[PDB]
């Protein structure tokens, strides 16, 4: 009994030499709560990203997660093993990785949510906005992620999400966007009427200020 309790203790205290096998682990519970609960996700300011190639691109850009879950049978990333990174690496089994994320490529990064752009630019911008995208009441996250991806590709001056939108830090939108949240070219702002900010007031101010149709 003492050996079993000490093994479970080390599992909770993942100190090198053990892999995770139970979904009741604190880190797996943190991952699944960050994936499901949007309020807890916004309170923790973290997100879950899947894909070794996407994680490598984020590292190239300069973004690295504080936690990485690698599936057994796959090697460790060079960008995760180099000395400049502070990313902890944890071995994960197949079914617990599926419980963590519904789609497991073998690499799951617990990234820090990039700070949303300050609305002060949209309020009082020096340069004139050429074209601004306004997404209104999108239901499924796939379409939202794809339109974020194509907006980042076409380099729109600003993107706004008005009055209804899937949480931009959700796994599906993250997959369908592939770095649109981490990039800093196209600023995106989620204006939720229930939060106090007037979407139509903001839009009419932008119009009357930048002479937009």
């Amino acid at each position: 009994a003492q050996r079993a309790l000490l093994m479970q203790l080390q599992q909770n205290v993942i100190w090198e030499g053990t892999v995770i096998s139970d979904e009741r682990h604190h880190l797996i519970q943190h991952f699944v709560k960050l994936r499901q609960n949007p309020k807890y996700r916004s309170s923790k300011q973290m997100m879950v990203v899947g894909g070794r190639h996407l994680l490598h691109e984020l590292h190239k850009r300069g973004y690295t997660p504080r936690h990485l879950l690698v599936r057994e049978g796959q090697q460790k990333p060079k960008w995760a093993t180099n000395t400049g990174v502070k990313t902890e690496i944890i071995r994960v089994d197949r079914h617990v990785a599926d419980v963590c994320s519904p789609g497991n490529d073998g690499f799951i990064g617990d990234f820090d949510i990039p700070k949303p752009p300050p609305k002060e630019s949209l309020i009082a911008n020096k340069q004139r906005f050429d074209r601004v995208l306004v997404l209104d009441n999108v239901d499924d996250p796939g379409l939202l992620g794809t339109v974020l991806r194509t907006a980042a590709g076409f380099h729109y001056d600003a993107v706004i999400a008005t009055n209804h939108c899937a949480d931009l830090y959700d796994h599906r939108v993250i997959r369908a966007a592939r770095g649109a949240h981490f990039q800093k070219a196209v600023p995106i702002y989620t204006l939720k009427e229930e939060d106090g900010d007037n979407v139509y007031g903001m839009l009419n101010h932008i119009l009357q200020r930048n002479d937009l149709s």
Binding site: N125, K126, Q127, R128, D130, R131, L133, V147, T150, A151, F154, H155, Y156, D157, R209, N210
Partner: protein, 96 residues
């Protein structure tokens, strides 16, 4: 989005390649980019331009006095004979 993408009107600006090439670019076209259109042109905007209130000024003076007394107290804290001899021989090697 592909229709109303940014700079998508450049295909319609020039009605013909000959008419487009007839125009000659000048350094004025480069110079006009440095001027912000909506806002007025200003020289510098740094942290020193931030005006302070009376409470902020009093707090800053208090922090400066605290820093002064902290330097004074560290002159005696680091005066432990080991570190004091260390700094003394370092100054000697600097001047020599």
């Amino acid at each position: 989005l592909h229709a109303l993408r940014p700079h998508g009107n450049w295909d319609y600006l020039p009605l013909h390649n000959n008419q487009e090439q007839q125009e000659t670019a000048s350094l004025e076209l480069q110079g006009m980019k440095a001027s912000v259109d909506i806002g007025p042109n200003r020289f510098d905007l740094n942290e020193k331009d931030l005006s302070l209130d009376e409470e902020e000024q009093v707090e800053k003076a208090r922090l400066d006095n605290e820093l002064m007394r902290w330097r004074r107290l560290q002159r005696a804290q680091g005066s432990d004979y080991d570190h004091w001899m260390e700094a003394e021989t370092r100054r000697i090697q600097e001047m020599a």
